[PDB]
Amino acid sequence: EDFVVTDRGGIVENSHRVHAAVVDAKGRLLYALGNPTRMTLARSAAKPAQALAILETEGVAGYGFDDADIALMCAAHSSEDRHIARTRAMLSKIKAEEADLRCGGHPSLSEMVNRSWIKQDFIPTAVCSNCSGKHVGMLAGARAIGAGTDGYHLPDHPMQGRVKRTVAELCDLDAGDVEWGTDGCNLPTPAFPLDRLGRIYAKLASAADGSDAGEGQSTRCAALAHIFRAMARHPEMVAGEGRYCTMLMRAFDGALVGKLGADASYAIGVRASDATRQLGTDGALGISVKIEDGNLEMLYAVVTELLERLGIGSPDVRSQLASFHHPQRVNTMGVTTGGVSFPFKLRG
Amino acid sequence: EDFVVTDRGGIVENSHRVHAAVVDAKGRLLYALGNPTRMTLARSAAKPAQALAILETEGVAGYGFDDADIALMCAAHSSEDRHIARTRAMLSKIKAEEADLRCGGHPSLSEMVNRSWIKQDFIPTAVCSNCSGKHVGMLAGARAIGAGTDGYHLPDHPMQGRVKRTVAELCDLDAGDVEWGTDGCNLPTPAFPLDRLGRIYAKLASAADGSDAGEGQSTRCAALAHIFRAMARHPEMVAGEGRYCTMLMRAFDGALVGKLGADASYAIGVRASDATRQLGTDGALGISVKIEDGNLEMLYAVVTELLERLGIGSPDVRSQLASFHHPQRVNTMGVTTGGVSFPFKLRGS
Ligand SMILES: [Zn+2]
Ligand SMILES: [Zn+2]
C-alpha cells in the first residue's frame, strides 16, 4: 500500500508502487517501504562497486587517475563536452583509443544536451556513453593485469570475474544470490535484494567516516573512502548540470553521496550525523529505493520526500531540490492542474 | 492482480498494473483485467463525446465540416503540417482566428515531428495543439447558438454545460457520478469508471453498424455513426504517421476505431464481426484500458496483446503492430537484453 500518486484536480491520474530500505553500516534494516528485499537490477547504481573492482586491480594505481576520473567511473553522466573530454583524457592515460571501448552511444541522459544533439543531427559514439568512465577503468584494469583488452566486457574476462566477486562481497551475499543480466552499455549488470544496495552505500559512507577520523583502514575500506570523496568532490562528473544526483550532492556538501540506476532505482550513502543518530544508529546509513514501474520523475520526488521524513539535511539544504520533490503540473496555458502526493508510511 | 512485466535476462525490471474492460453495446461487462470500474480520467479518449456535443449543437451543420474535419475534432494529432493546415481551414469555416483559441502549444506527440521543430527552433502556438480540432469545434458550437466565443472553454459557458451533460448521457451516469478536472489544453476533462469509457466506444461502433444496416436512428445515433465513420476514414487526422492509433486503424480498415488518452488510457470501438460473435455478443464491442502508472510503451503492448487474446483481427492484420506488441529491448551495441511479458488471464463473465 506504499504509493506515490499524481492527481488532476484531486482525481487520481497515475499511481506508482514504492519500495525502499534504510539500513545501517552492517546492513541491518532500520526502516522500509513496500518490499525492502525486492530482487532489483541495480543498473548504474552498481557503479561504486564496479569502480572498487577497478581500483583494487593491481597496477591501476600506476595510471594516475585523479578524483575526477574516479567520479566519472562512478558516473551516469549527461555526455556533456567535459565528460567526453575527460573520457578521452583517461583513454590517453592508459594509451588506448576510442575504438577499444565496447560500450555504445545513446541519446543523452540530459534533455537539454540531447536537444542540442538533435538540433545538430549528432550521432553519439562509444566515447559519449554515460558509462564511458566505467569502461575506461575496465580497460585500464584489463591492461594492468596483462589479460588482453579485447573482451574486457565479457563475463569470462578476469575483469568481469573481479566485478562479480566484488559485488557479492560488498553485498555480503553468496555468488548464487546475485543474478546477472546485460546493461545498456553491454557489461554484465547485477541484481540483488534492494536492501543490499543500501548496504553497499552504507559501506561507502562508513568508510568515508573512518578515513576522515584517521582510523586504520584495510585496503578495501581506504578505496571505498576514496570513491565516496571522489563522488562528493566532483558530483558534476557523476551526472551533470541540472541532474538530480549532481544537485543532491552539491546541496549536501559532502554529507552524503547519491546515485541513479536506470528504470528508477536510487541509492544514498549517509555519513554518520545527528540525523542518523536520531534514527537510532551509531554509524553511517544507507538508503535504497525502487519505483516498481520505472518512472524517474516519481523516483526523484520519492527520494526527496524520504530524506525529509528521515530528517536528513535541513529544510534549506533540501529546498535546493524543491522542483524534484513537488514536480510542476502546469498545462499549456500556465494553469496548475494537479500535483504529486505521497500516500506511503515508513515502517520500523 | 494483472501486470505487464519487463525483464532483463529474465530478471524482472519493471512491472505495470493493467486495468481493462471489454463491454457489449449496452455496456455489459464481458471480459476484464485489473479493476474494470476504476475511476479514470479519459483525457483525449473522451474526444468523441466532446465531438458529439459539438455536432449536436444547433446550427453547427451550417459550417460544412467534412469527415476529415470531424476526425480532427476527435484527434490527438501529431501537429504535422497537414493537421495545422486543417485547423486553419476549420477556423476559416467558422470565421474565427487563432487568437480565439484557448488551448496552448506543446511539444509534438510525435518524436519525429518534434525533431524537425527543434532543428527549426520552432515554438508551437495554439493552432499546433493536439486538441486544436476539438477547440475549433467548440468555438463553432459557441458561435452557432450565439453564446459568444469568449470563455467557450469555461465550465459556466453553455458549450461546456452541453459537453458535461453529453458525457454523462453517453456513459449512462448521473451528473454527480462524473468528476471533472482541467486538461492540458485547458478544457474541462471528465473522469468516470473505466468500463464506461468502453461503453462510449461500443456505442460508436454500434451506431455505425446500425447506420450501415439502414436502421431507424435518432439524431444522436446518426451522429455517433458519423463520428465513427469520420475516424475510420481519416485515421491520419486522429493521430499521424507512425502513431499507434493511425497504424491500428489502417490495419483494421474500418472494422474498429481506437484512440489514446494521455497518461496511458486507450479505447476501441469494434464493429460486429465473426470475432465479436465468438466473444459472446450479438452486437458491437467496446474495449478500454488504463496502465496504472501511465507508461505509453506498455499501453500499446498491452492493447495489442489484448486484441490477440480476443481474436480481433487476423494474425496477419495484427503483425502490422508487432513493433508495439513486443517493444524492442536491444542495447547500445545491438544485443537483445530483455523483453516484455503478459502474465495475466483475461477474466470472462
Ligand atoms: Zn553501464
Ligand atoms: Zn484536450
Author numbering:
A (entry chain B): 5 to 352
B (entry chain A): 5 to 353
Which sentences from the paper describe this structure?
The introduction of alanine at position 80 resulted in minor structural rearrangements of the protein in the active site area, which were nearly identical in the four protein chains. The S80A substitution affected the hydration pattern of Ser48, which is no longer surrounded by the triad of closely spaced water molecules. The Oγ atom of Ser48 is H-bonded to the Nζ atom of Lys51 and two water molecules, resembling two water molecules of the typical “triangle”. The Nζ atom of Lys263 is no longer able to interact with the Oγ atom of Ser80, but it continues to form H-bonds with the neighboring water molecule and the carbonyl oxygen of Leu264. The fully occupied Zn2+ binding site is conserved in the mutant structure. As observed in the S48A and K51A mutants, a sulfate ion from the crystallization solution is located at full occupancy near the metal binding site, forming H-bonds with the Nη atom of Arg47 and the main-chain N atoms of Gly188 and Cys189, as well as with several water molecules, one of which belongs to the metal coordination sphere. The side chain of Cys249 is most likely oxidized and was modeled as cysteinesulfinic acid. Another serine residue, namely Ser80 from the second Ser-Lys tandem, is an important hub for the H-bond network in the active site, interacting inter alia with the Ser48 nucleophile, to the point of forcing a non-planar configuration of the Ala79-Ser80 peptide bond. The S80A mutation turned the protein activity off, as the proton shuttling network could not function properly. Furthermore, the mutation led to protein aggregation, suggesting an additional role of Ser80 in maintaining the structural integrity of the protein.
